[PDB]
Symmetry: C3
Subunit: 223 residues, 3 copies
């Protein structure tokens, strides 16, 4: 039906397999700290799996009028990210034993990032969609700022090493989302929805399963 | 108007009385641990009370097209369960001093269970509704698994005793929900909505007020 | 377009400036406890900023049929309060080192207060709107009760002093909301929407930025 269906189907399959792999791999783990990381990390692709399935079956898709056309908007992505992005930030924060204040700042700014992105995606006045994109981007920039300038002296080498790798992976991949949104169907519409869907699938799988494989294979998750 | 109104009214009344009873019973409690259990346990029927009232007044009801008919779907149940089921799991987890990793696993899987159940309840393609039911059921099975195989050596007798009772009550009652959903109006439609509503009221009151009476009368909630 | 636009624009500007001020003021803070208070306190007007902008642009506004008319209902307020009121209660609770049980009681009752207020705001049967208002008010009264009768012996003077001031500010300002709602467009409609919007803007800015200035200038936030 929809040309982007193949990418949604592949996304569903990859998130599903990733979830199952992490689920199996986490069996037997008794270390409290490691359990936290496995729980957070397995839940991420499990949620993504449900939302990709939602998009594939057509439930997480809605039509938004703007620019004089009926624009297909997959709102299920925000329902996904609303829960998965904060969880991913939690993995990074727990890894460096961040204090509660910083965790709340990250989670709250993340909520603002996704919430304003959702508002922008459903906004009927074309020009306003970009106002929301700008605010969401400012929130993302705040998050990236905190990750880099927001624990070193008393920090295990493996912890510092894995955190630096996951932080770099996060900054690169997350930074692409606003660009894809801006040039894709939710924004300027210069890149067709099918290609946009492919881009998000690669980014999502990398930021979730890729990110997860790196974290769960590290000894940093253990006390 | 709607034949199932009597069960919604009785459900509203029972949840309301249960809330008031727990509220009174919890007065004077100074023990920190006991306070946690009273807060969690009183909030559960208070939320259920609001959603049952929502259904009674008709606000938590919507019409979903599928199978060639306008099907009355009480979505308010998921708004209820989304918050009450995780809270109930929290009572069980705190009772056994479960570690954060396991708590997150339970809460996250519970969210998936209710979220996919909601998607299934509102899905317009009949066959797909059952795909969502299957995923939600898999999440429930994971939860039941964790409760039984997911703390013994260093565990007070009263704690182990009450937990085992509440765990058995939980497995039996919770396991009935997917069956009721499957044979009821949201699924195969072989059992009429009025009878389905009665079933859920008995299950809800038992899983909330019944469950609550057992827990709050035990000495396990005290340090 | 809408006469109340000026108050929404001023609200947007004030919440935005307040957010920026708190953001700057919180720079350099290394004290863990102080960080918690700055995070919570800065997030509050940041969220309010987004919802006021939502109302200004028209996204957070919907039409609800009741009383034989199309009533303009700004639902964005509840999306705001759902997150900001619990955060404000968290500031007060952390300030007095409240135990988890009491925190959950406050947060849960707050959720009920806002959730039932939202249901009332969107209810099509006029008389029922007031039933929801009554339940929401009962939840607010419970919260006010807990704040006054729910830690003294072992409590720093500055902490007790600032808490008492913020508690008084909270009881006075919060108590006004149900009155405004009752006499405003969501209720009896005796006070026009434009005036109602002005009232909420003054209350919101005072309960958020005013409240925030008092808290963040106190030494109580430091360990
Ligand atoms: C599993 C998914 C991940 C890690 C998704 C990350 C999403 C973002 C960083 C999204 C950010 C956006 C903006 C900064 C601007 C507005 C549009 C968004 C929501 C695509
Ligand atoms: C107070 C209510 C309780 C304890 C409700 C429990 C609800 C469930 C365990 C629901 C589970 C469902 C499935 C496993 C399959 C799909 C349909 C549901 C949501 C009814
Ligand atoms: C930043 C906003 C604040 C501090 C808002 C406070 C909101 C309330 C205390 C609202 C309470 C209401 C009731 C008690 C009755 C029903 C209507 C409401 C939601 C306006």
């Amino acid at each position: 039906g929809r040309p982007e269906w193949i990418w949604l189907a592949l996304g569903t399959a990859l998130m599903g397999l990733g979830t199952l792999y992490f689920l199996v791999k986490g069996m037997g783990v008794s270390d409290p700290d490691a359990k936290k990381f496995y729980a957070i990390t397995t839940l991420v692709p499990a949620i993504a799996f449900t939302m990709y399935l939602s998009m594939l079956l057509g439930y997480g898709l809605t039509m938004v009028p703007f620019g004089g056309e009926q624009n297909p908007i997959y709102w299920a992505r925000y329902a996904d990210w609303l829960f998965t992005t904060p969880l991913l930030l939690l993995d990074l924060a727990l890894l460096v034993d961040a204090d509660q204040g910083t965790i709340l700042a990250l989670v709250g700014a993340d909520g603002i990032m996704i919430g304003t992105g959702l508002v922008g995606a459903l906004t009927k006045v074309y020009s306003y969609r970009f106002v929301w994109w700008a605010i969401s981007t400012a929130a993302m920039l705040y998050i990236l700022y905190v990750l880099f300038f927001g624990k070193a002296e008393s920090m295990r080498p493996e912890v510092a090493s894995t955190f630096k790798v996951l932080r770099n992976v996060t900054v690169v991949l997350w930074s692409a989302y606003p660009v894809v949104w801006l040039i894709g169907s939710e924004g300027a519409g210069i890149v067709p929805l099918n290609i946009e869907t492919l881009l998000f699938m690669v980014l999502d799988v990398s930021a979730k399963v890729g990110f997860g494989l790196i974290l769960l294979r590290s000894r940093a998750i253990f006390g």
